[PDB]
Amino acid sequence: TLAVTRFPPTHEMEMHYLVGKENLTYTDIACDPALMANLPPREVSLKEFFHSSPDSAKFKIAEGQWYRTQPDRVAFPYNALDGFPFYSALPSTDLKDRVLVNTNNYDEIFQSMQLAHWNMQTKFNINVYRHMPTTRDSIMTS
Amino acid sequence: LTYANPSNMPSEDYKWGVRVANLKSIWTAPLPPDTRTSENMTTGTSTIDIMGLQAAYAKLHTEQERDYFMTRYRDIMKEFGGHTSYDGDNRPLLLMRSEFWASGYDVDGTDQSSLGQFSGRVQQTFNHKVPRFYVPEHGVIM
Known part of the structure; x- marks a missing residue:
């Protein structure tokens, strides 16, 4: 029995693809069914999604993916505030790492902590039905 | 037809109108x-x-x-x-449209020379009804 505590991936600097990629072509803005439904996956960079991010950290997205979704939006007034369970830092150039959550970017959200990020107190009420000896019949050489 | 003034359109285009x-x-x-x-x-x-x-x-x-x-x-x-x-x-804005076939009758010649000769007379009664219409702004109805 395992536990996993997580926060929605809200970054303080994620931009709408269409707003971060400068020149808008017919293919990006029109959402032509014929087009989206028929060309290869699009390779994009952490740069068409994050405000400072390197042009170099790439990943493959489905054409028109920007039209099936919407990022969360956090005003700049926030990115300078500790106490908000959001992603401050920039992604992780690397695919893997920048998907499997970057825990550490939550250290600043808590006060003091020698009980990690989260603590739990539970009573595990289990009940197993067997065919066991018995307490007295085992200690009873008999 | 990017004619500037009627003094720019062909003689017969502005005499009898442009060809449909x-x-x-x-x-x-x-x-x-x-x-x-x-x-x-x-x-x-x-x-x-x-x-x-x-x-x-x-x-x-x-x-x-x-x-x-x-x-x-x-x-x-x-x-x-x-x-x-x-x-x-x-x-x-196309408000109303009427279409019809015009006909008439033949006139029988009856003198020595044109007896067995005819002239078609096309008289066609027509009617067109433009239902009441609300004029949003100032303009012309052609």
């Missing part, structure tokens, strides 16, 4: 003259991109549609499932 289109025949409604009879996809010397080809077809589609049916914005729009006000493309 013939009633749809086989030879009287050819395919758009700029209609593609082929489409090249620049391929590699000893390989073709199976995925690029796919895409090639998606683009030609969008082109073909514009060529045959959506030569008009208001038209490329409608095929998107949207609508455009006659105010979006500044098009005169």
Whole structure:
């Protein structure tokens, strides 16, 4: 029995693809069914999604993916505030790492902590039905 | 017809009016003259991109549609499932339309020389009704 505590991936600097990629072509803005439904996956960079991010950290997205979704939006007034369970830092150039959550970017959200990020107190009420000896019949050489 | 002034339009175009289109025949409604009879996809010397080809077809589609049916914005729009006000493309609004076939009768000649000769007399009573209409702004009804 395992536990996993997580926060929605809200970054303080994620931009709408269409707003971060400068020149808008017919293919990006029109959402032509014929087009989206028929060309290869699009390779994009952490740069068409994050405000400072390197042009170099790439990943493959489905054409028109920007039209099936919407990022969360956090005003700049926030990115300078500790106490908000959001992603401050920039992604992780690397695919893997920048998907499997970057825990550490939550250290600043808590006060003091020698009980990690989260603590739990539970009573595990289990009940197993067997065919066991018995307490007295085992200690009873008999 | 980008005529500036009636003093710029051909004599007979402004005397009797510009020529309207013939009633749809086989030879009287050819395919758009700029209609593609082929489409090249620049391929590699000893390989073709199976995925690029796919895409090639998606683009030609969008082109073909514009060529045959959506030569008009208001038209490329409608095929998107949207609508455009006659105010979006500044098009005169068609309020009413009447169509009919004009006929008459023949007149029988009866003198020594034109007995067995006739002259067709085309008298056609017609009527047209423009239902009441709310004029949004100042303008002319042609």
